[PDB]
Design a protein around this ligand. Structure first.
Ligand SMILES: Nc1ncnc2c1ncn2[C@@H]1O[C@H](CSCC[C@H](N)C(=O)O)[C@@H](O)[C@H]1O
Ligand code: NI
Length: 454
RNA sequence: CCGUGAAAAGG
């Protein structure tokens, strides 16, 4: 039978969720990276069980017409750009296909129109944030990205999909951590000082926050290292320290300190100014977030008398960008630093009709139900894991006739939609947006609508 | 799920 690195000619017939190539081999399904439909490869088997297997391209016999390369002294996987070998138009078609397929396979919904993916004019160098691990590799302190399904660091200077300024700051920081001989983190030995570098840069403002993620409070010569980097990049207005002392894959720990300047940067979205703290979420592709937000606004058909609840509000980018053309905005957030951004961001743009709280989304709804606040619309933008049942049910009991659900994960979105249908919400429209070009990730906005009156 | 373009291990 087929066993580890036997060699076999196969033809790819489809692309998985992750963008891996599917091949059939004598009853078995094989998954293989950097192989597009139509391509014929010699395939070396990596592992094979009963049913499923994994394979690697030994040689390309015939390459797809849709392959990029061409481009270009790769950029070869790394982890960053797992759809980068695909031309950009086929990326869009793939993401549209992924939304239809999940809607059907999980929600059971065959009967809805899924618009084609709204692509990016220049789908490169788009990321306003870099979270870079710092490790010891072949003697030397290195910045880079983990290989898929590993914590094997691949040294890197060019990151392809990042704002190129962020790239330079990371390389400058790397050169300064070598020269001041600061000690990189080691996961196994549980030793060292420098765990991660985080660099965020305003898309419109150009203001940079640097975060040093470290295992301990004390960093020898930190002020001298700040002074050097601030000389090279005078757009740096914030240098912060995060202390993460735990054996965990979470990048950030509990404690934050300001080593230099402010503990926020300012950026603009939709002509409103927003202050952004280090641990607050901010969409990593601003240009496309602006179209995603606009899309959500147009789906929701707001009027001057509407009362919006902004669940999972963050720093209130959605909330406050609708606040001018509605009656009231009510927002719930998880982490204080972001709510205090919210209240300050309201103040900053002279918005009196937006009301933020700290809480879980469920409780603020419970409090708002008892308080007598009657919302017309619900805007939710949850993380990858989606919504909880408890939130879905509490949201459906407000009588809100419209729900705009913004999602960065179709799997959970669909599950959540299926629930909302059993509580009298019909899925009216769905619009994928390409927030993460060259990756398998897809951003969607779905509009949900009250039929029943209950 | 902790867990955030990648994100082992361990819960
Ligand atoms: N159960 C819950 N209740 C309220 N907020 C939550 C939550 N779970 C996660 N969150 C928060 O919801 C946010 C999702 S990110 C959405 C923020 C917004 N689009 C922006 O651009 O700023 C995160 O900040 C997260 O901390
Ligand atoms: Ni995925």
């Amino acid at each position: 039978m087929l066993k580890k690195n036997d060699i076999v000619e196969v033809e790819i017939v489809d692309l998985t969720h992750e963008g891996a190539g599917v091949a059939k081999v004598d009853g078995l399904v094989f998954f293989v990276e950097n192989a597009l439909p139509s391509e014929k490869i010699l395939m070396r088997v990596l592992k094979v069980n009963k049913k499923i297997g994994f394979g690697k391209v030994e040689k390309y016999l015939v390459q797809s017409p849709h392959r990029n390369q061409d481009l270009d002294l790769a950029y070869l996987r790394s982890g960053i750009a797992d759809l980068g070998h695909l031309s950009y138009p086929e990326q869009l078609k793939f993401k549209t296909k992924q939304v239809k397929d999940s809607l059907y396979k999980i929600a059971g919904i065959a009967d809805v129109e899924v618009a084609e993916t709204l692509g990016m004019e220049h789908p490169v160098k788009y990321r306003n944030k870099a979270q870079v691990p710092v490790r010891r590799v072949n003697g030397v302190l290195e910045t880079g990205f983990f290989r898929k399904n590993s914590h094997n660091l691949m040294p890197l200077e060019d990151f392809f999909i990042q704002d190129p300024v962020i790239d330079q700051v990371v390389v400058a920081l790397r050169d300064l951590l070598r020269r001041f001989d600061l000690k990189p983190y080691d996961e196994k030995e549980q030793s060292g000082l420098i765990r991660n570098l985080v660099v965020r840069r305003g898309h419109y403002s150009g203001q940079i926050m640097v975060v040093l993620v470290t295992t301990r409070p004390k960093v020898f010569r930190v002020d001298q290292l700040i002074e050097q980097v601030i000389k090279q990049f005078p757009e740096i207005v914030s240098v912060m320290q995060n202390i993460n002392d735990q054996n965990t894959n979470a990048i950030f720990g509990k404690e934050w300190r300001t080593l230099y300047g402010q503990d926020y940067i300012t950026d603009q979205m939709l002509g409103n100014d927003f202050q952004i703290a280090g641990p607050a979420f901010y969409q990593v592709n601003t240009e496309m977030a602006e179209k995603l937000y606009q899309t959500a606004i147009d789906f929701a058909e707001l009027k001057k008398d509407d009362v919006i609840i902004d669940a999972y509000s963050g720093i209130g980018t959605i909330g406050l960008s609708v606040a001018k053309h509605v009656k009231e905005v009510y927002g719930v957030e998880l982490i204080p630093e972001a709510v205090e951004n919210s209240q300050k961001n309201a103040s900053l743009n002279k918005i009196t009709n937006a009301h933020y709280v700290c809480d879980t989304a469920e409780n603020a709804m419970k409090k708002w139900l008892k308080e007598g606040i009657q919302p017309t619309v619900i805007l939710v933008d949850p993380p990858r894991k989606g919504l909880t049942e408890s939130f879905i049910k509490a949201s459906a009991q407000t009588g809100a006739d419209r729900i705009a659900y913004i999602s960065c994960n179709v799997a959970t979105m669909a599950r959540d939609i299926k629930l909302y249908q059993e509580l009298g919400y019909e899925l009216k429209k769905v619009q994928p947006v390409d927030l993460f070009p060259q990756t398998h990730h897809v951003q969607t906005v779905a509009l949900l609508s009250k039929l029943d009156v209950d």
